[PDB]
Write a protein that binds this ligand. Structure first.
Ligand SMILES: Nc1ncnc2c1ncn2[C@@H]1O[C@H](COP(=O)(O)OP(=O)(O)O)[C@@H](O)[C@H]1O
Ligand SMILES: Nc1ncnc2c1ncn2[C@@H]1O[C@H](COP(=O)(O)OP(=O)(O)O)[C@@H](O)[C@H]1O
Ligand SMILES: Nc1ncnc2c1ncn2[C@@H]1O[C@H](COP(=O)(O)OP(=O)(O)O)[C@@H](O)[C@H]1O
Lengths: 440, 427, 52, 97, 48, 27, 435
């Protein structure tokens, strides 16, 4: 279990097979038009065909922009990357604004890579070479194979390797009675330690007296690892390793870290294309969600032209809040949603509506249901009535403190008295604004 | 393999003839004849390459194919000539100055190519033998025409052992450096397969002479030489743009060395293109730098694009056309793109839905052209795919008028959005 | 095929390094002579194994 | 090592010398026709750098000096006058000409 | 070429010389005109 | 717990401790 | 490849008077002979911190003249081109960029002798001793003219090991630097194996141990940097040139102090010659008021170079002040410290012959009717634009199968492309469509 947050109740866009909404499917109520619209863009994501497509969720605050923006994330499931960022995260000390944008852009493109690996392990009981006829003149002792016997908790089996493994085995310095690891395709021998059946009884040694392996001597499995392109980029930019004194940039943390196209494109898109066209990996192009996009700079908005016009881009959901508003970083240029007209020409706009009282009663009920509150129909109606006067979010937020008053007062559910009490302990924005307007 | 269709995937280059005559809708580009012909002229001068630092500004309305023309030039120019595309706002770094960023953008679009003949041994390993002692051994190699045998020195034995190569591998030896590179398994490289091992990675073995002489080209951008000479770390060239290159005896020193290589013929200089999109984002300091960066003999041609006309320049309160000072504007040839005719709009939509692999009815084309002529072309391009998804959700075969009308109702176009913004949200 | 041999054409002693032997660690859980628990310690002065 | 001391290349011996540059061009153009060439130069130790220059281009050649003993002179002339697959004959203008 | 041909000693030798010295001038010019490691090998260049 | 008071160190400053006898083995 | 190539001198007579058309410059007589005085001021090496301002409208040759000064001076003196915009660094103080650019405009031509050991190393032995590190390494070397033996430092042994040398292979050592190179195996050994990773080279020639005199040239800035962030060679302070290595505000204590002292010490013991050069701050009009006010102290210094400024503005606001405005965009305080050279705006005939010189610089044949038409375009729009039409028109000429530009060629090209003046009316008519 985990703590309840603002959007813990939304579990999907709530769409039936024709792509409509009944009235309140999967934790969202109302907004049928907007939920249908981003129902289309969910399938735009699932088809994996388009790049850099962008949609702007535009409406008043509290009209579910964030809610259905991440209901999209619920519809897509955890398989595809859904990368959230707020419009204020772009301003950074270490790295240029547009570089944050590029990092987030290909942080939203996933790559899930499937690879079987197959392994042999066990306590090694036999280690005998196999002599053969002299390949050339009479030196004797021509080793053609080497027999190695491995024991696990399942059974004991003997195995023939070619002599190169005899050399590697000796160079790994394994002994009879310890536990090894052999990787069939690659050919490695790794000593994972003397077998615990030869127990540490008075040995204090730190080298692992490793328990006898469970399961078969031979075991294979398809490892399935999903990485974002940004993970590959970062791992190539500042790599690990105990050598190459540059790798001892280890006291230092990592400023200056704007990644380079030569690497980004020239060295890292080729390997992804290779793995994809080889049958090793699948691209999972995801979503980049930018809420409060109005906080971006004019330089950022203009960079998004180029970024959204790329073939190697996710689809981008923007959410905005402001009216016709001054673009940040400009000298008094006013434009809709605080976003330059130039970028608005590039986004399909989804309009979110302001709720009716009925819809607000439904949302209040769902939020009470989610936070674990029991609420009487009278208290629910009163929350609805005081929530028609002020914002939905305040109406919803009164639930938990009112429930605490109920619990203190010994009640099992919110009686109307408690919502009345809380609505006088705490104010909303509008009431407080009136107080401030009265007193100086 | 997976580089999804973006906004510009459909244009495979400028649809020009052998006489720089633009076709109406050939090679993915539609209409826009005059500006496309101008782009062809400057593309041919890019290819000829004998003039440095010439500058072109593609001006025009928002949406009238400026970026389409630029990427058409990029696609028609092809690889092996540097085309560096940059947004004007990319040069505002925290790690380096505006002018270092612009120098690096310029230099990243000049290539230096060193072309060298070298002799290799290419063959299928028939045997390798090697003794511990000053270890010593022999190697026998085959090509479809012949075989031969080599005695191996200690360093060669070491490098062969470092790759674990064996019979049946098909390999190259660079006679000058001795690095082995197994291209794969010859059909005689099959293991005994009495137990598990390496997979069946088979490939054909080589033909002709066992030892042969062939050409290798080492191409690096001027920024790339510059970076890797800057300081001994140098993997900077991949790490990040962490720079601030010292002008002192790196610009002049690289220029003199590359000019000497050009003159004595060791290297060929391949000047490319720097495309600055949304160049109006540059600072008056940036334009001031461009003035004299253009006036150089290691300067590529740079192309620029801008949507805006009479408006103040960034970093000051000076009005000017295109938002560029008439100082830099005097170094340029200006190519202005025109708005689209109804038939050009219809034909762009036709090509664009062909790229997106969606069928539409002619009435759907009619209404969508009407939409993209009343509102804006980009919106009509965005309705293609949305209507396609609406269509496929009803299991339709092709996009019909009702699909486009529905999805038009479903998404807004910044005109209807501003009209609906009559609610005073957070002004 | 492309099979591999390693021949110890030298003194066979150089092959004799590897084979034969392969013994276990003979000891097993020792029981203390007082509480007859399995031992955890061995006294340095007697070498007797013990638990408590 | 490279960033602290610069040594002369020594590999492409046509570097400083425009004579060898135009000669490389000329021989490359003649190679398509394959009709073989005599390269006369005095300065016995200049034949040395021609001998190096032709290996850089992979041309099969042989060369004739005041130092080549008599029987070898006849053998070289026979293995070029009556043998193809040799492209080039480097020779001294006096002893060979 | 232009360095050697302009040096004080070469100017003097071309002004007066007992034949063989001026023939040595133009034969040093054989050297520098044919290829320069006849005349002088290109130096290793190194920071001051 | 094992804080070494002034007392215990003044105590170990008394007559010396005797030597060990580890040689024997009987198991 | 060309750009400002046409100009290759000031085009002056033996009297220092402008020849009206010579050496690539075809106007600007007063300005060019004033630049003659300036080049004589530079070549006398007598003055420090004198400053020139080339002032006039855009395209009036004030950069052509400034670069022609660089050609008139030759490649022997330093000429440092700089754009004003270059002072706005992230890694170093704004005024520091400027004061280091002054330092690399002053050159220093200095002669060095460095000792070389080279050849096939025939034998090696490290001198072992108790400390218990190595004391030295003894070596023996062979060349086509002789043989010798020597003792070498442990650092040189360390670098020989970095190189992985072997007995019987060719090496080079520059003992002042301490640097080493393994140049390969000797050609004689090429028969030893049928395949090897080695490169085989003929034996070195001349003496096994040799010396020669090399006339380097550096700048005062190079000495400054060399002491601020040393390569050093023989130390592990590569650790300072690493995990750090940025630009630093290196300071008077050495820049005006130690470096000046050692350079004078070289000069007046005959080892070096000072070569004052030029710092050409182009686009000076957009330095900061801080930079302009620092140039006061820079032009008044007794060691400074000659500084050429180029400016292009009317009277406008100085950058960094936001209130005060001044001519050329330069504060009157600095404008009092410079000699101002006017550059004139070209008449149609001067402009026409610039077109011709430009055309013949990049191998363009142009008929005189088309040349006259480009002159008309130039006076209608601007010099630089009609000059720029040349190459596109030649491309259309090639495509039409012609070998020279003709009238309809420049008409077509002048129709495809617009100038700044002719694009402004397009942007003004349909004002609310471009944004
Ligand atoms: N359609 C909806 N269905 C259910 N709950 C909603 C809906 N719209 C809003 N809410 C609730 O109201 C809150 C306000 O919506 P939200 O999207 O966060 O505001 P904004 O639109 O300003 O981002 C949400 O946190 C959520 O709890
Ligand atoms: N000439 C053209 N040929 C084909 N497609 C075009 C053309 N002009 C515009 N388009 C389409 O219209 C859209 C807008 O073009 P774009 O180049 O982005 O305009 P601008 O960059 O000038 O604002 C692009 O996504 C492209 O698909
Ligand atoms: N007197 C001249 N003679 C020949 N060419 C000239 C002359 N003046 C200018 N030019 C050419 O015209 C261009 C404009 O002059 P320039 O020095 O750039 O002026 P500014 O630096 O003020 O822009 C030069 O780049 C050069 O090619």
């Amino acid at each position: 279990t985990q703590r309840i947050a603002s959007h813990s109740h939304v579990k999907g866009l709530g769409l039936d097979e024709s792509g409509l909404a009944k009235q309140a499917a999967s934790g969202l109520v109302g907004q049928e038009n907007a939920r249908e619209a981003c129902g289309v863009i969910v399938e735009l994501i699932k088809s994996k065909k388009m790049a850099g497509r962008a949609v702007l969720l535009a409406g008043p605050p509290g009209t579910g922009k964030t809610a259905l923006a991440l209901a999209i994330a619920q519809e897509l499931g955890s398989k595809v990357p859904f990368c959230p960022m707020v419009g204020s995260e772009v301003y950074s000390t270490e790295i240029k604004k547009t570089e944050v944008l590029m990092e987030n852009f290909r942080r939203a493109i996933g790559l899930r890579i499937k690879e079987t690996k197959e392994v042999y392990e066990g306590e090694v009981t036999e280690l005998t070479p196999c002599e053969t006829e002299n390949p050339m003149g009479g030196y004797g002792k021509t080793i053609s194979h080497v027999i190695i016997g491995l024991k696990t908790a399942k059974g004991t089996k003997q195995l023939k390797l070619d002599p190169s493994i005899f050399e590697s085995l000796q160079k790994e310095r394994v002994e009879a009675g310890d536990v090894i690891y052999i990787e069939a395709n690659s050919g490695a021998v790794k000593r994972q330690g003397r077998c615990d059946t030869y127990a540490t009884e008075f040995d204090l040694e730190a080298e692992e007296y490793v328990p006898l392996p469970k399961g078969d001597v031979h075991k294979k499995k398809e490892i399935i690892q999903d990485v974002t392109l940004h993970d590959l980029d970062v791992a190539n930019a500042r790599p690990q390793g105990g050598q190459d004194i540059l790798s001892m940039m280890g006291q230092l943390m990592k400023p200056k870290k704007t990644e380079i196209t030569d690497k980004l494109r020239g060295e890292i898109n080729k390997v992804v294309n290779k793995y994809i066209d080889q049958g090793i990996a699948e691209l999972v192009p995801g979503v980049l969600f930018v809420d409060e996009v109005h906080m971006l700079d004019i330089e950022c908005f203009t960079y998004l032209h180029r970024a959204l016009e790329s073939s190697i881009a996710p689809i981008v959901i923007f959410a905005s809040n402001r009216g016709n508003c001054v673009i940040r970083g400009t000298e008094d240029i006013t434009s809709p949603h605080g976003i330059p007209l130039d970028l608005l020409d590039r986004v399909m706009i989804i309009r979110t509506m302001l709720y009716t009282p009925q819809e607000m009663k439904q949302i209040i009920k769902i939020r009470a249901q989610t936070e674990g509150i029991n609420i009487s129909e009278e208290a629910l109606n009163h929350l609805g009535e005081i929530g028609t006067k002020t914002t939905l979010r305040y109406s919803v937020q009164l639930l938990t403190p009112a429930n605490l008053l109920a619990k203190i007062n010994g009640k099992d559910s919110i009686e109307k008295e408690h919502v009345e009490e809380i609505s006088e302990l705490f104010y909303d924005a509008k009431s407080s604004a009136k107080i401030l307007a009265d007193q100086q | 393999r997976i580089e999804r269709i973006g906004a510009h995937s459909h244009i495979r280059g400028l649809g020009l003839d052998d006489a720089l005559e633009p076709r109406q809708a050939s090679q993915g580009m539609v209409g826009q004849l005059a500006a496309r012909r101008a782009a062809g002229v400057v593309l041919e001068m890019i290819r000829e390459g004998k003039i440095a630092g010439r500058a072109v500004l593609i001006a025009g309305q928002p949406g009238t194919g400026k970026t389409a023309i630029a990427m058409g030039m990029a696609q028609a120019l092809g690889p092996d000539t540097p085309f560096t595309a940059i947004a004007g706002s990319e040069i505002f770094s925290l790690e380096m100055s505006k002018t270092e960023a612009l120098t690096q953008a310029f230099r990243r679009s000049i290539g230096v190519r060193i072309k060298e003949e070298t002799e290799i041994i290419e063959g299928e390993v028939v045997e390798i033998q090697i003794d511990r002692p000053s270890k010593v051994g022999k190697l026998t190699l085959k090509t479809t025409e012949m075989e031969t045998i080599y005695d191996l020195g200690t360093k060669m034995i070491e490098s062969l052992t470092k790759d674990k190569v064996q019979a049946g591998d098909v390999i190259t030896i660079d006679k000058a450096t001795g690095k082995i590179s197994k291209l794969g398994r010859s059909f005689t490289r099959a293991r005994d397969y009495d137990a598990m091992g390496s997979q069946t990675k088979f490939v054909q073995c080589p033909d002709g002479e066992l030892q042969k002489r062939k050409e290798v080209v080492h191409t690096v951008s001027l920024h790339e030489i510059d970076v890797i000479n800057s300081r001994t770390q140098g993997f900077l060239a991949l790490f990040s743009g962490d720079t601030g290159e010292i002008k002192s005896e790196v610009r002049e020193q690289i220029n003199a060395k590359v000019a000497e290589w050009r003159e004595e013929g060791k290297a060929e200089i391949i000047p490319g293109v720097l495309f600055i999109d949304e160049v109006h984002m540059l600072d008056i300091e940036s334009f001031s730098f461009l003035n004299r960066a253009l006036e150089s003999d290691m300067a590529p041609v740079l192309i620029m694009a801008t949507n805006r006309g009479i408006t103040r320049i960034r970093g000051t309160s000076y009005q000017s056309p295109h938002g560029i000072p008439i100082d830099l504007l005097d170094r340029l040839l200006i190519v202005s793109t025109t708005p689209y005719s109804e038939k050009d709009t219809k034909q762009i939509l036709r090509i664009r839905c062909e790229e997106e692999d969606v069928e539409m009815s002619e009435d759907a084309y009619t209404v969508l052209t009407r939409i993209g002529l009343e509102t804006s072309l980009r919106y009509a391009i965005q309705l293609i795919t949305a209507a396609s998804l609406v269509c496929r959700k009803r299991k339709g075969t092709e996009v019909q008028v009702d699909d486009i009308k529905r999805v038009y109702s479903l998404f807004l176009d910044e005109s209807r959005s501003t009209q609906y913004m009559k609610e005073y949200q957070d002004a | 095929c492309s099979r591999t041999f390693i021949t110890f054409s030298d003194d066979a002693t150089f092959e004799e390094w590897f084979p034969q032997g392969r013994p276990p660690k003979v000891p097993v859980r020792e029981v203390c002579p007082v509480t007859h628990r399995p031992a955890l310690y061995r006294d340095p002065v007697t070498d007797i194994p013990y638990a408590t | 090592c490279n960033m602290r001391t610069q040594f002369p290349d020594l590999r492409l011996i046509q570097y400083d010398c425009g004579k060898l540059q135009t000669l490389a061009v000329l021989l490359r153009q003649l190679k398509a026709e394959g009709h073989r060439v005599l390269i006369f130069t005095q300065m016995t130790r200049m034949l040395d750098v021609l001998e190096q220059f032709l290996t850089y281009h992979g041309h099969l050649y042989l060369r004739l000096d005041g130092s080549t003993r008599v029987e070898q002179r006849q053998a070289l002339m026979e293995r070029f006058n009556a043998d193809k697959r040799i492209f080039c004959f480097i020779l001294s203008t006096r002893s060979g000409g | 070429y232009d360095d050697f041909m302009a040096q004080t000693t070469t100017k003097e030798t071309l002004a007066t010389g007992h034949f063989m010295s001026v023939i040595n001038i133009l034969m040093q010019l054989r050297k520098v005109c044919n290829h320069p490691n006849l005349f002088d090998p290109r130096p290793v260049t190194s920071p001051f | 717990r094992h804080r070494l008071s002034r007392r215990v160190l003044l105590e170990v400053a008394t007559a010396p401790d005797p030597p060990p006898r580890p040689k024997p083995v009987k198991m």
